[PDB]
Amino acid sequence: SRLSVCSKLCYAIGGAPYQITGCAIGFFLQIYLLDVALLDPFYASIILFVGRAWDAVTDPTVGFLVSRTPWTRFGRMMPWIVLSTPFAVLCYFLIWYVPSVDQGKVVWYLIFYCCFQTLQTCFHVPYSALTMFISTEQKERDSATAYRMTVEVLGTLIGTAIQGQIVGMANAPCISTEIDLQHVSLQDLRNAYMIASGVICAIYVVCAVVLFLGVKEQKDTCRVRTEPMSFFQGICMVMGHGPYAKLVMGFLFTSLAFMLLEGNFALFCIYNLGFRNDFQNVLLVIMLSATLAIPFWQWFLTKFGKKTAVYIGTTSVVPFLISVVLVPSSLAVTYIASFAAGVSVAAAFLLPWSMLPDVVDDFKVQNPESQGHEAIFYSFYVFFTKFASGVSLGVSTLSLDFAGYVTRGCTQPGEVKLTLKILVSAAPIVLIIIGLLIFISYPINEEKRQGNRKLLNEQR
Amino acid sequence: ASKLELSGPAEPRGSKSAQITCKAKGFPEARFWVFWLFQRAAALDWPAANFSGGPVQFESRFQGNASLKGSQAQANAELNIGALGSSTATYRCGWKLANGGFFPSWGGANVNGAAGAKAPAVYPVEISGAGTGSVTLGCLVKGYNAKPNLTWPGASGALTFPSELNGALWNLASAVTGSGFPSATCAVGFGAATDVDKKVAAA
Amino acid sequence: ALDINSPEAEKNAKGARARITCNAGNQVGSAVAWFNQRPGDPASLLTYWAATEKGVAGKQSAQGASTKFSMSSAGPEAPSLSSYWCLLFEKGAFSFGGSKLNPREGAGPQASILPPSADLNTSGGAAVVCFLPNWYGNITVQWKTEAPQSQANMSWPGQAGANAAYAMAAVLAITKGDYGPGSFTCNASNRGTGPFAMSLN
Ligand SMILES: CC/C=C\C/C=C/C/C=C/CCCCCCCC(=O)OC[C@@H](O)COP(=O)(O)OCC[N+](C)(C)C
Ligand SMILES: CCCCCCCCCCCCO[C@@H]1O[C@H](CO)[C@@H](O[C@H]2O[C@H](CO)[C@@H](O)[C@H](O)[C@H]2O)[C@H](O)[C@H]1O
Ligand SMILES: CCCCCCCCCCCCO[C@@H]1O[C@H](CO)[C@@H](O[C@H]2O[C@H](CO)[C@@H](O)[C@H](O)[C@H]2O)[C@H](O)[C@H]1O
Ligand SMILES: CCCCCCCCCCCCO[C@@H]1O[C@H](CO)[C@@H](O[C@H]2O[C@H](CO)[C@@H](O)[C@H](O)[C@H]2O)[C@H](O)[C@H]1O
Ligand SMILES: CCCCCCCCCCCCO[C@@H]1O[C@H](CO)[C@@H](O[C@H]2O[C@H](CO)[C@@H](O)[C@H](O)[C@H]2O)[C@H](O)[C@H]1O
Ligand SMILES: CCCCCCCCCCCCO[C@@H]1O[C@H](CO)[C@@H](O[C@H]2O[C@H](CO)[C@@H](O)[C@H](O)[C@H]2O)[C@H](O)[C@H]1O
Numbered sequence: 001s002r003l004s005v006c007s008k009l010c011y012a013i014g015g016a017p018y019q020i021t022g023c024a025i026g027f028f029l030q031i032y033l034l035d036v037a038l039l040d041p042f043y044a045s046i047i048l049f050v051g052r053a054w055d056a057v058t059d060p061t062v063g064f065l066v067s068r069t070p071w072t073r074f075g076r077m078m079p080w081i082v083l084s085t086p087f088a089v090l091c092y093f094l095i096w097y098v099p100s101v102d103q104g105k106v107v108w109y110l111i112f113y114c115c116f117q118t119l120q121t122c123f124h125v126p127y128s129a130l131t132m133f134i135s136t137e138q139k140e141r142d143s144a145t146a147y148r149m150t151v152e153v154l155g156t157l158i159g160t161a162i163q164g165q166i167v168g169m170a171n172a173p174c175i176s177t178e179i180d181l182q183h184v185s186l187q188d189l190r191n192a193y194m195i196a197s198g199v200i201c202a203i204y205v206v207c208a209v210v211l212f213l214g215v216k217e218q219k220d221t222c223r224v225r226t227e228p229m230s231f232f233q234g235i236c237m238v239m240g241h242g243p244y245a246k247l248v249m250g251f252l253f254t255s256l257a258f259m260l261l262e263g264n265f266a267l268f269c270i271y272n273l274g275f276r277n278d279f280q281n282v283l284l285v286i287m288l289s290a291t292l293a294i295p296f297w298q299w300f301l302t303k304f305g306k307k308t309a310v311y312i313g314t315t316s317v318v319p320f321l322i323s324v325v326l327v328p329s330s331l332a333v334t335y336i337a338s339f340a341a342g343v344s345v346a347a348a349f350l351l352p353w354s355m356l357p358d359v360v361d362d363f364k365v366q367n368p369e370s371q372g373h374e375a376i377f378y379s380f381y382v383f384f385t386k387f388a389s390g391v392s393l394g395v396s397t398l399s400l401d402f403a404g405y406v407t408r409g410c411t412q413p414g415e416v417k418l419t420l421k422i423l424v425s426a427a428p429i430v431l432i433i434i435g436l437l438i439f440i441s442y443p444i445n446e447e448k449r450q451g452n453r454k455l456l457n458e459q460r
Numbered sequence: 461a462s463k464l465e466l467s468g469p470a471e472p473r474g475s476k477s478a479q480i481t482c483k484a485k486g487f488p489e490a491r492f493w494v495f496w497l498f499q500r501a502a503a504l505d506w507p508a509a510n511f512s513g514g515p516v517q518f519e520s521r522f523q524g525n526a527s528l529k530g531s532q533a534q535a536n537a538e539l540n541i542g543a544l545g546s547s548t549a550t551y552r553c554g555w556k557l558a559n560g561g562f563f564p565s566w567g568g569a570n571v572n573g574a575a576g577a578k579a580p581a582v583y584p585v586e587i588s589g590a591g592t593g594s595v596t597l598g599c600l601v602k603g604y605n606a607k608p609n610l611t612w613p614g615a616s617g618a619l620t621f622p623s624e625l626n627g628a629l630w631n632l633a634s635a636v637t638g639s640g641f642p643s644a645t646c647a648v649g650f651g652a653a654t655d656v657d658k659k660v661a662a663a
Numbered sequence: 664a665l666d667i668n669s670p671e672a673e674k675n676a677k678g679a680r681a682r683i684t685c686n687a688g689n690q691v692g693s694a695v696a697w698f699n700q701r702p703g704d705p706a707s708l709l710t711y712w713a714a715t716e717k718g719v720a721g722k723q724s725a726q727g728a729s730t731k732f733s734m735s736s737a738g739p740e741a742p743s744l745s746s747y748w749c750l751l752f753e754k755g756a757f758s759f760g761g762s763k764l765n766p767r768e769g770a771g772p773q774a775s776i777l778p779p780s781a782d783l784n785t786s787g788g789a790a791v792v793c794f795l796p797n798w799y800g801n802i803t804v805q806w807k808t809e810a811p812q813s814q815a816n817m818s819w820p821g822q823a824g825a826n827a828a829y830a831m832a833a834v835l836a837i838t839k840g841d842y843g844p845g846s847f848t849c850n851a852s853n854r855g856t857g858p859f860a861m862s863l864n
């Protein structure tokens with residue numbers, strides 16, 4: 001009576017819409033708001049910051065509400081998913097819809113972005129908590145989490161490819177300004193965005209049906225569950241731990257730099273590298289390079305140590321981020337740096353998760369009482385990364401507004417391109433250097449104490 | 461708030477050069493393109509635009525005629541106009557939204573490229589020996605080079621037609637629909653010390 | 664330079680609705696601004712991106728997708744009877760069209776001819792003045808000094824605030840030497856199925 005392979009596959013497939021919608025939004029929402037939705041970059045900055053901060057705000061509140069959810073005849077998590085998915089796909093389709101209003105499009109995008117983030121949180125937090133209810137054996141939970149991670153990577157690739165190849169296929173006319181002084185329509189581009197959103201919503205509904213049908217609950221009846229309302233106390237205990245806090249800050253910064261790149265990289269490809277009709281292929285190349293480089297980094301962390309792996313993975317993108325702003329936008333150099341940046345994205349979003357179980361074991365050795373540190377760490381990390389990535393994206397789009405970013409444009413002023421080169425080349429490098437300096441102060445010192453901590457894990 | 465204060469009206473003579481100014485305030489002038497317009501009793505033309513911290517971009521019609529300058533230490537945007545003759549118009553100084561390309565705030569200053577300065581001549585044009593109920597009297601003002609203000613003594617039935625060029629001077633007409641005719645006089649409003657008021661007689 | 668074109672340079676509307684149409688010679692991709700200029704005042708922005716207001720009364724909405732744009736006033740008041748312009752912000756050389764609103768009235772013109780005065784005759788001149796004070800529409804003035812004349816200067820005011828009717832002044836300037844061609848007639852042609860002739864001898 002174990003978890004079947006079909007049940008684990010359905011549970012993993014249920015985790016694909018979150019990655020698809022998140023990658024589509026995080027790669028193309030700035031392009032949609034600034035160019036397709038014809039918004040002032042002040043309003044686009046407001047919308048991006050408020051949506052990506054309301055996601056972080058909704059994560060623990062909906063987490064607590066799910067922790068207070070009683071047991072129904074369908075489950076503790078399945079009613080949330082089933083009653084949240086139609087409203088979530090409605091709000092997602094209405095994110096990428098441009099209404100015909102006289103004033104207050106910013107309010108439309110704010111309301112529907114924040115409503116979609118709330119409903120996607122109501123989808124995901126029960127779904128993330130569902131790994132403790134599918135089976136009681138820890139090996140089955142780890143296998144389900146491995147399936148979920150693999151299908152999350154594949155969902156990232158599929159969502160990026162779908163949004164890029166539907167959005168980018170139908171181009172739109174540009175807008176010449178005085179910096180340029182001496183058939184496809186804009187409605188076709190909006191229709192392409194609506195088609196991509198509809199396809200993503202169809203995948204969302206199909207995977208929701210798969211997750212509902214193929215996954216049971218077994219009741220569990222809180223066999224070993226506990227209130228654990230010690231959220232503030234757990235946060236304080238984790239931050240009081242040295243290696244834990246250092247891993248939190250390092251990973252957080254590194255992920256902040258790469259989320260800044262994920263936000264303001266399509267604009268850099270369009271308005272600095274000149275890829276007005278080929279930026280989607282660049283994003284697809286980056287995602288394929290990351291998918292290819294996952295086994296390379298899993299090999300490198302073992303054959304050469306996790307510490308040196310997490311150093312060179314974060315420092316590998318720095319020469320190429322320097323290169324992409326110091327060359328006259330050569331077509332081959334951009335693809336080579338795209339492959340390198342995909343390899344570094346894979347390193348940055350893989351290797352700290354490899355480093356995490358060592359710090360978990362170290363915290364177990366230090367504090368014998370451990371009741372959620374693996375989840376308290378992820379909650380703190382996801383909250384701070386979402387909130388500060390929203391802050392960074394809002395500051396980026398507001399700086400584009402300050403620099404005089406032209407809506408569409410075919411050419412940006414010399415100050416907007418400077419801000420884009422800073423937002424791709426200066427601030428991500430600064431954040432990566434900060435994360436690297438934090439990772440330098442690492443008292444775990446990779447395996448040199450780790451097995452000894454594991455020895456204490458054998459002792460206790 | 462964003463505002464642009466323009467200079468007063470200028471009267472160049474044929475082929476002089478005229479420099480118009482905008483003392484832009486309420487916004488960083490170096491961040492936005494300050495434009496110019498051109499309305500000679502018609503729709504709006506487009507002379508040029510000037511980025512106050514950089515390039516100047518002209519329309520091909522005004523290349524060599526207009527020259528835009530920007531003093532960022534005074535937040536002043538200026539237009540120097542060269543050879544003239546048909547550039548009598550109203551020039552605007554609309555700034556631009558940094559993203560769209562439209563003009564949110566505007567100015568307005570008149571340029572009159574003519575020659576001469578003469579005192580108006582008043583002629584009391586009247587009836588030709590007819591009358592039926594209400595009758596129309598008139599007043600012709602001919603030969604001036606400024607803006608007058610024709611008035612009547614407390615009678616509000618007047619129609620003062622807009623002035624027109626007759627050579628190098630201006631001609632204007634005024635009409636009044638008066639029922640009874642005890643006494644009527646036409647008073648003009650030529651500010652340059654020419655305040656001649658003349659009565660209207662019969663025949 | 665994209666050719667922005669407003670077909671009707673004069674529009675009739677009293678209190679019901681006005682639909683000012685702008686047509687572009689090239690597809691601008693929904694980038695059309697609408698300005699409202701009152702006489703003696705600079706042009707004031709109303710609409711941008713063909714559908715977005717800028718702090719203006721809600722009656723002035725606007726639509727349009729590609730090379731066919733419209734601005735609609737549904738509550739047209741006395742402040743709304745001004746001049747309007749449609750600007751394109753698709754390409755660098757920006758261009759405008761030009762249009763204006765007017766109230767609606769009936770018809771019926773008037774005419775009066777006035778000979779030159781003795782004071783003007785003394786100082787070597789003779790201006791014959793034809794006044795057309797109250798009419799609605801467009802009118803044409805012809806001068807006949809026993810033959811058609813094409814040396815007259817014509818002027819028109821705007822529209823009266825109360826009467827809501829136009830006017831016209833036609834001045835025929837003739838020197839004293841050429842002041843013997845018989846009789847001077849001013850002929851007005853409006854929408855009245857007949858010319859109004861006022862003559863002096
Ligand atoms: C197309 C390329 C896509 C992407 C770019 C770069 C990518 C790295 C891809 C990596 C592989 C895994 C990605 C990182 C993990 C996914 C997110 C995540 O990490 O979320 C799931 C889970 O890893 C949460 O961690 P949690 O502590 O909650 O699980 C504890 C479970 N248990 C108690 C039973 C032991
Ligand atoms: C998007 C990615 C997924 C693409 C589609 C992938 C193919 C779907 C199969 C995935 C699971 C395969 O795993 C295997 O599936 C079959 C069919 O359900 C199961 O087989 C089970 O159902 C079939 C009926 O359908 C019975 O005849 C069989 O007696 C029973 O064991 C196996 O117990 C399971 O080991
Ligand atoms: C809109 C986005 C959010 C989507 C998800 C929001 C709704 C899903 C949350 C779970 C609520 C389930 O709804 C639940 O129904 C059952 C009725 O059978 C009731 O639940 C109750 O059932 C019986 C009594 O009737 C008892 O066992 C117990 O008191 C309680 O479990 C409550 O009405 C509610 O707890
Ligand atoms: C699975 C996902 C897909 C499922 C189907 C989803 C279909 C969604 C298509 C978009 C339909 C909504 O379209 C949008 O509706 C609202 C409300 O009428 C309109 O909004 C309009 O009405 C409201 C009324 O309060 C006013 O603010 C104003 O008159 C205007 O904004 C938008 O101008 C219109 O563009
Ligand atoms: C969480 C922090 C939130 C910070 C928000 C800061 C920016 C907010 C934008 C302020 C302007 C938007 O506010 C907007 O005002 C106009 C009316 O004036 C409303 O617009 C409404 O009336 C206008 C006509 O007057 C029409 O477009 C239509 O009937 C309807 O959409 C919008 O429904 C409203 O959304
Ligand atoms: C479009 C081109 C890409 C097509 C990709 C198609 C993938 C189809 C399924 C293949 C999954 C490959 O699986 C590969 O093997 C290792 C295990 O050895 C997995 O590793 C997984 O299990 C180990 C522990 O058991 C842990 O590191 C972790 O739980 C998880 O990463 C990875 O998920 C993946 O790197």
Ligand SMILES: CCCCCCCCCCCCO[C@@H]1O[C@H](CO)[C@@H](O[C@H]2O[C@H](CO)[C@@H](O)[C@H](O)[C@H]2O)[C@H](O)[C@H]1O
Nearest residue numbers: 005012013016017143146147150151154155158203207
């Ligand atoms: C709809 C949106 C996109 C959806 C895409 C869905 C594609 C599904 C790809 C299959 C991913 C699972 O791939 C699986 O992962 C786990 C750990 O990672 C590994 O397999 C692991 O579990 C199976 C369970 O029977 C064991 O037999 C195997 O010994 C073990 O290593 C393999 O890598 C791979 O068998």
Ligand SMILES: CCCCCCCCCCCCO[C@@H]1O[C@H](CO)[C@@H](O[C@H]2O[C@H](CO)[C@@H](O)[C@H](O)[C@H]2O)[C@H](O)[C@H]1O
Nearest residue numbers: 187188190191192193194195196197198199200202203
């Ligand atoms: C399930 C995955 C495979 C599906 C493959 C089928 C591809 C299409 C997926 C369904 C998505 C439909 O998406 C739909 O696209 C069309 C045009 O593109 C839009 O239709 C739109 O076109 C006109 C163009 O003048 C607009 O004025 C209007 O707003 C709207 O009707 C719909 O508003 C949108 O809902």
Ligand SMILES: CCCCCCCCCCCCO[C@@H]1O[C@H](CO)[C@@H](O[C@H]2O[C@H](CO)[C@@H](O)[C@H](O)[C@H]2O)[C@H](O)[C@H]1O
Nearest residue numbers: 162165166167169170187188189191192195196199203
């Ligand atoms: C994982 C599943 C993947 C499924 C992917 C399915 C996506 C299908 C790609 C379609 C290509 C996108 O390109 C889009 O195609 C449709 C179909 O002609 C067009 O939409 C069309 O329908 C609308 C309907 O009113 C009309 O205005 C017009 O006939 C045309 O515009 C879009 O103008 C074009 O921009």
Ligand SMILES: CCCCCCCCCCCCO[C@@H]1O[C@H](CO)[C@@H](O[C@H]2O[C@H](CO)[C@@H](O)[C@H](O)[C@H]2O)[C@H](O)[C@H]1O
Nearest residue numbers: 004005006007010205206207209210212213214215216
């Ligand atoms: C309309 C478009 C949307 C749908 C797209 C197509 C959906 C494809 C997925 C079909 C559903 C898969 O999930 C379906 O559910 C049952 C359980 O309820 C699963 O059944 C499995 O889980 C439980 C676990 O105890 C047991 O019943 C059984 O041992 C096992 O086979 C199967 O894996 C599958 O038959």
Ligand SMILES: CCCCCCCCCCCCO[C@@H]1O[C@H](CO)[C@@H](O[C@H]2O[C@H](CO)[C@@H](O)[C@H](O)[C@H]2O)[C@H](O)[C@H]1O
Nearest residue numbers: 392395396399402403415418419422423427490491513
């Ligand atoms: C919090 C994480 C997010 C990271 C945020 C990083 C964004 C950094 C913003 C880049 C600033 C761009 O730098 C900009 O360059 C130009 C040209 O030298 C200079 O700006 C210059 O032009 C502007 C006109 O726009 C005028 O105010 C003035 O002439 C001068 O300041 C300044 O140096 C600076 O305004």
Ligand SMILES: CCCCCCCCCCCCO[C@@H]1O[C@H](CO)[C@@H](O[C@H]2O[C@H](CO)[C@@H](O)[C@H](O)[C@H]2O)[C@H](O)[C@H]1O
Nearest residue numbers: 039040042043046050556557559560563564711716717
């Ligand atoms: C949640 C974050 C904090 C809440 C938001 C705090 C600030 C809210 C700003 C309130 C007013 C919003 O509007 C603010 O006012 C100026 C007025 O010139 C606007 O300035 C611009 O508005 C529109 C935008 O294209 C242009 O047509 C116009 O030409 C221009 O003046 C800006 O759009 C914005 O900076």
